[PDB]
C-alpha cells in the first residue's frame, strides 16, 4: 500500500521528520561520543553499528553547517520532506537522473530549474 514512487505513505510518516544520511551520521557519532564516555553503559547494538557504518559510507556532507545549508536550501522550495531527503542523499547529477530516482518529482518543477537546484546541492557538497 505504501509506495515511495507514487508518493504514498501510511499516516504515521506524515508528521515524521526526515533526515539526510549525513544528519544521521553526525548524530550517530554524537551517540558514539555519549557511549564511549559515560562508562557502565551498554555498548551500542550491532544494528547501531551497521547503520553507523552505512551512513558513514554514504554521508555526502561531512560538515554540520553544510548539511544545514543543504537542508535549508531544500526547504525554501516547495518540496516534500521525502524528496528533500532523497535528493540530498542520492545527490543526483542530472535532472533526468533525479526523475529516474525520484519519480515523485514527476512534472513538479522544470528540468532546468531543477538542474540549478541540483547544482546548488553539488556546489555545497563538501570535500572529504
Amino acid at each position: 500500500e505504501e509506495d515511495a514512487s507514487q508518493l504514498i505513505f501510511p499516516k504515521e510518516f506524515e508528521t515524521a521528520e526526515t533526515l539526510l544520511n549525513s544528519e544521521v551520521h553526525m548524530l550517530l557519532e554524537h551517540r558514539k561520543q555519549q557511549n564511549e564516555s559515560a562508562e557502565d553503559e551498554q555498548e551500542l547494538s550491532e544494528v547501531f553499528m551497521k547503520t553507523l557504518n552505512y551512513t558513514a559510507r554514504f554521508s555526502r556532507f561531512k560538515n554540520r553547517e553544510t548539511i544545514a545549508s543543504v537542508r535549508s536550501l531544500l526547504l525554501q522550495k516547495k518540496l516534500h520532506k521525502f524528496e528533500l531527503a532523497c535528493l540530498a542523499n542520492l545527490c543526483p547529477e542530472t535532472a533526468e537522473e533525479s526523475k529516474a530516482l525520484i519519480p515523485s518529482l514527476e512534472g513538479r518543477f522544470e528540468d532546468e530549474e531543477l538542474q540549478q537546484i541540483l547544482d546548488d546541492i553539488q556546489t555545497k557538497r563538501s570535500f572529504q
Binding site: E2, D3, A4, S5, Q6, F9, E12, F13, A16, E17, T18, L19, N21, E23, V24, L27, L28, R31, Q42, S45, V47, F48, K50, T51, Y54, T55, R57, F58, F82, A85, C86, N89, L90, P92, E96, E97, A100, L101, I102, P103
Partner: protein
C-alpha cells in the same frame, strides 16, 4: 529511509527504584527497552533522542509496581516500496546479490539483476559481470537499487531490490 518520530511507552517500575534518582531509572529503562529493537510499523529503531513527558505514575493496586507512561522521540529507518537507496553488496550468489541498506538486508534476485550481467563464480572475487566486464558488481561495491518489496520476519525488515530502471546499480 531515516526519520525522526515520536512514540509511546509505559514502564513498570519495581519499588526498589522508588527513591531519589527514580526518574533517571525511568529513563534508563526506556533506553534499555525500546532501543535496539525493530518493529514493522516503524522499521529499524536506531536510537531514542529525547523523551518528552513522564506521566503520573500510578501504583498498580496489589503488586506494587508503578506504571509510568512516557512520551518520547526516536530515530527510525523505514524503507518504502519504490524507493531507491544506495546499498553495499556483501556477498554474491548465483541467485542474486545480498546487499544491506544500512541495518536492513536486501536481496536482488538474479532476475532482478539486468540481463547483460552474468554471475561468474570462477572469478577470484566472485562477481556479476558483463562479458567484456564494462560493468562489474562484486563484494563491497556500492550500488543503487529500487526497493521493490519489503517483508517482515521476526520484527526484522528485509527488502527486495531491483536494478531494472535507469541509473541504478554499480556506483
Amino acid at each position: 529511509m531515516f526519520y525522526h518520530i515520536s512514540l509511546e511507552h509505559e514502564i513498570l517500575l519495581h519499588p526498589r527504584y522508588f527513591g531519589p534518582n527514580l526518574l533517571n531509572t525511568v529513563k534508563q529503562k526506556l533506553f534499555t527497552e525500546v532501543e535496539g529493537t525493530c518493529t514493522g510499523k516503524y522499521g529499524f529503531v536506531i536510537a531514542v533522542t529525547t523523551i518528552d513527558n513522564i506521566g503520573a505514575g500510578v501504583i498498580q493496586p496489589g503488586r506494587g509496581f508503578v506504571l509510568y507512561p512516557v512520551k518520547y522521540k526516536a530515530i527510525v529507518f523505514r524503507p518504502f516500496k519504490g524507493e531507491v537507496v544506495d546499498a553495499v553488496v556483501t556477498q554474491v550468489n548465483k541467485v542474486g546479490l545480498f546487499t544491506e541498506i544500512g541495518p536492513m538486508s536486501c536481496f536482488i534476485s538474479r532476475h532482478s539483476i539486468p540481463s547483460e550481467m552474468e554471475f561468474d563464480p570462477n572469478s577470484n572475487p566472485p562477481c556479476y559481470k558483463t562479458m567484456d566486464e564494462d560493468i562489474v558488481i562484486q563484494q563491497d561495491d556500492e550500488i543503487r537499487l529500487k526497493i521493490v518489496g519489503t517483508r517482515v520476519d521476526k520484527n526484522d525488515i528485509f527488502a527486495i531490490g531491483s536494478l531494472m530502471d535507469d541509473y541504478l546499480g554499480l556506483v
